[PDB]
Design a protein around this nucleic acid. Structure first.
Lengths: 116, 48, 100, 143, 111, 50
RNA sequence: GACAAUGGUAGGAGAGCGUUCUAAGGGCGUUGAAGCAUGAUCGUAAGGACAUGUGGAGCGCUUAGAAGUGAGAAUGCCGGUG
RNA sequence: UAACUUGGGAGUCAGAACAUGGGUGAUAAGGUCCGUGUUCGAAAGGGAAACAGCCCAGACCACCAGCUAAGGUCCCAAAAU
RNA sequence: ACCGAUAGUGAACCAGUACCGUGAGGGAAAGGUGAAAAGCACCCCGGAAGGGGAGUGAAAUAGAACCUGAAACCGUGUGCUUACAAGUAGUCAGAGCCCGUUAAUGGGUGAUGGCGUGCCUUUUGUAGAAUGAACCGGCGAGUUACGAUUUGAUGCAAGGUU
């Protein structure tokens, strides 16, 4: 028997048009143009998920370095001392300590300076 | 019961259809390769 | 008064009466949990050392065990007919630090 | 998640003044670019400008090493066919002293919308006095 | 309370009419009849007959005094175009569009 | 010379910014009471009488 | 539950979703079916529900069967509109 | 941890650079034709300012965790003025 | 286990007819109000056309250009935002402002900071200045009959089968 294609192509074309809303001009109205930008956004999100871990780890290192220059020391001499002292506190926690509690960062610096 | 029928397990299969999408593995070229005499409609050379 | 605990491969700074989200736990919803590894205690209390301070455990009650919002993993190669789409919902566990 | 970001509300900018009497051009411009950018404090927040205002007095008496007073030429074009101008380093210090220092610092800042608002916090003067006495700029020793 | 009046199958092209409707929009009922009468566009006598009948509905059917009526909404929509042919050189033939618009005037009392 | 590219709705609506007309510049005649153009006669009952 | 494996074109192999029709069974509907529109919903994907508007008489579900069974492009064809 | 044998279905017969052993050319060519490896082809990621073929290294998915490779640590721009 | 108005005969329709060629000849487009015309008496603006009410009907945004009424496209209002800025127009991070959901690690807008030269064909190699696409909708390409061979399944077995 004959099988007229109906209501099945409009349904899957409307999902892609809705996935691209807020775009500029014909990028949110026409189907052939929005389909390509939907595919480009999927490839962009996969690359930016693995790059979000890169640019945040470097953001903490600067804030730690700025807090170390106040005590006559650099970042390279601070993480070497925390190892010989057996501290094992990551960058994310050292960044939130110096911002909130200034007294706590002096105790970690004195222990790391005594380890030489 | 005609409302509960089951064929013998392992006796029936679904045919293959080439040229229907790309995820099937038999899309554009439809299992023929690139240009040549064995890619045009009408077969190729006789084995004789 | 805060503390730094290692729970799911990472480290979190906790406080009394706080809603935190961590990796999946084997405990049931409504029960209690206890973090044994504490790395740093400070704030109002006296400063302590490291890697792990003696005792000073943290107790917390379980609130909910659910899944996050769904994402769509789509990649493709141009001029090469090869694309693949996946989906993902990562489970999590919510706790409330009642005592530090 | 658990990281602190500084918005427009909690930002405090200070005024500093630097003395350029007996210092190298490139060695001085690099440390001033750090003060303008805001990398001196723990609340960096890259997408927001947290730098401080800086003032450089005594723009003259900027020292060069080697044959730089003569062998360093500054080029610029004017979008006209054949129109190209050249000024040596020694002559720029004599006519427009502040321009020699102001361009060496602006060449180290990023060229963005935010990197242009940061370069507007610099005030360079050839003399030994600054007009901005209303504020209270504190002296700063370069390290 | 409102009063509408629509003119359909108006032979004048739509975007030629929208240039004049952007002048009476928001004005009073007295200031709009004068603006339309002292201008020399093609759609001037057409828009005036539509704005005049919209005031006749506001007094006969509805009960309100025309001393303080303002023009609330004015716009022009599309219509069924007419397809024509213009013979050109070397046997070619071009297309000519005899367009059509729908005029709509809405008056109100601001209450 | 033919257009190399299509025209946007943004670029088309920016060009027609100044494609407008102004008010005819009318005044009121204190003989016929109705509006009229300047330096012209009242088109209704009346005359110039300058 | 321990260990190991999971980048991929031409190509080989396996497992699934959806459209129309027939058979048997069992259901829904003028207290409003199909379709159309919107939504912050559920699945590993193809895809599946529900509520609210419009609509005015048909249509799902389970197990098998048979195919004019899936569209983004061929200076593709017809219609409409820039 | 693979090899050989029997049977079913294929695709491919336009290759490129780089290191090296050699013909031809003029110890010319991103030239051309052979031997032996690697990468691309069919390979994302980091480095060489941008740069299929060069150096490091082979992406099942998620994380605002840690340690290294080639290359790097005055500013742009993460780390020694 | 045939089609349901781009389908089925070229033709559901007054079609081998408009129309196109000196001629032999070639050839389309066009179905649907409602159960029943019960097809809007009368009033108002207007020269008319077309409208605003009142009536008919279960429904008139079912009024003969009459069932449902999609997209392209053309408009009328408003909540955020934009006139020193170098843009495959997205993505990740993120203030401020404005709303309140299929109730959950909420929705709309986006000051500013990172990273980023469309898709398909054909190629040793393409952002390519190599090819194709103005846009939207519909239609549009491994099939069936008869033979051969190799696999899975079922019946019987020195027999098996018309």
């Amino acid at each position: 028997p004959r099988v007229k294609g109906g209501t099945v192509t409009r349904a899957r074309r409307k999902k892609t048009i809705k996935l691209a809303k807020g775009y500029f001009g014909s990028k949110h109205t026409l189907y052939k143009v929005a389909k390509q930008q939907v595919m480009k956004s999927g490839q962009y999100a996969f690359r930016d998920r693995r790059q979000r871990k890169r640019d945040f780890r470097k953001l903490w290192i600067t804030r730690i370095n700025a807090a170390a220059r106040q005590h006559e020391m650099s970042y390279s001499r601070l993480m070497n001392g925390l190892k010989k002292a057996g501290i094992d506190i990551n960058r994310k926690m050292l960044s939130e300590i110096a911002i909130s509690d200034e007294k706590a960062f002096a105790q970690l610096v004195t222990k790391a300076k005594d380890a030489l | 019961k005609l409302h509960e029928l089951k064929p013998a397990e392992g006796s029936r299969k679904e045919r293959n259809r080439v040229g229907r999408g790309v995820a099937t593995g038999n899309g554009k070229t439809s299992g023929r390769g690139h240009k040549g005499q064995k890619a045009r409609s009408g077969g190729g050379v006789r084995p004789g | 008064m805060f503390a730094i605990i290692e729970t799911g491969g990472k480290q979190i700074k906790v406080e009394e009466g706080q809603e935190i989200f961590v990796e999946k736990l084997d405990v049931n919803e409504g029960d209690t949990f206890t973090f044994d590894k504490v790395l740093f205690v400070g704030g109002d209390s006296v400063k302590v050392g490291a890697p792990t301070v003696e005792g000073a455990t943290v107790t917390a009650t379980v609130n909910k065990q659910g899944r996050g919002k769904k994402i769509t993993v789509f990649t493709y190669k141009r001029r090469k007919n090869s694309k693949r789409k996946k989906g993902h919902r990562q489970p999590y566990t919510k706790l409330t630090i009642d005592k530090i | 998640r658990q990281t602190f970001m500084a918005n427009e509300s909690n930002i405090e900018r200070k005024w500093y003044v630097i003395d350029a009497e007996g210092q190298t051009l490139g060695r001085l411009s690099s440390e001033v670019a750090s003060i303008l950018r805001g990398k001196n404090k723990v609340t960096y927040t890259p997408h927001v400008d947290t730098g401080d205002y800086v003032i450089v007095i005594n723009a003259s008496k900027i020292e060069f090493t080697g044959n730089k007073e003569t062998d360093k030429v500054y080029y610029r074009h004017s979008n006209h066919p054949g129109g190209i101008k050249s000024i040596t380093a020694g002559e720029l210090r004599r006519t427009n002293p502040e321009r020699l220092i102001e361009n060496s610092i602006k060449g180290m800042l990023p060229s963005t919308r935010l990197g242009e608002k940061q370069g507007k916090k610099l005030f360079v003067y050839g003399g030994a006095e600054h007009p901005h006495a209303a504020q209270q700029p504190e002296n700063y020793e370069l390290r | 309370m409102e009063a509408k009046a629509v003119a359909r199958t108006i032979r004048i092209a739509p975007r030629k009419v929208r240039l004049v409707l952007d002048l009476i929009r928001g004005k009073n009922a007295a200031e709009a009849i004068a603006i339309l009468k002292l201008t020399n566009k093609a759609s001037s006598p057409v828009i005036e007959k539509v704005l005049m009948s919209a005031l006749a509905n506001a007094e006969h059917n509805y009960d309100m005094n025309t001393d303080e009526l303002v023009v609330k909404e004015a716009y022009a929509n599309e219509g069924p175009t007419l397809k024509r042919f213009r013979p050109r050189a070397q046997g070619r033939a071009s297309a000519i569009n005899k367009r059509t618009s729908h005029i709509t005037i809405v008056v109100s009392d601001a209450k | 010379a033919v257009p190399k590219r299509r025209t946007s709705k943004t670029r088309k609506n920016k060009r027609r910014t100044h494609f407008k007309i102004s008010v005819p510049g009318m005044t009121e005649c204190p003989n016929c009471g109705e509006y009229k153009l300047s330096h012209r006669v009242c088109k209704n009952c009346g005359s110039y009488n300058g």
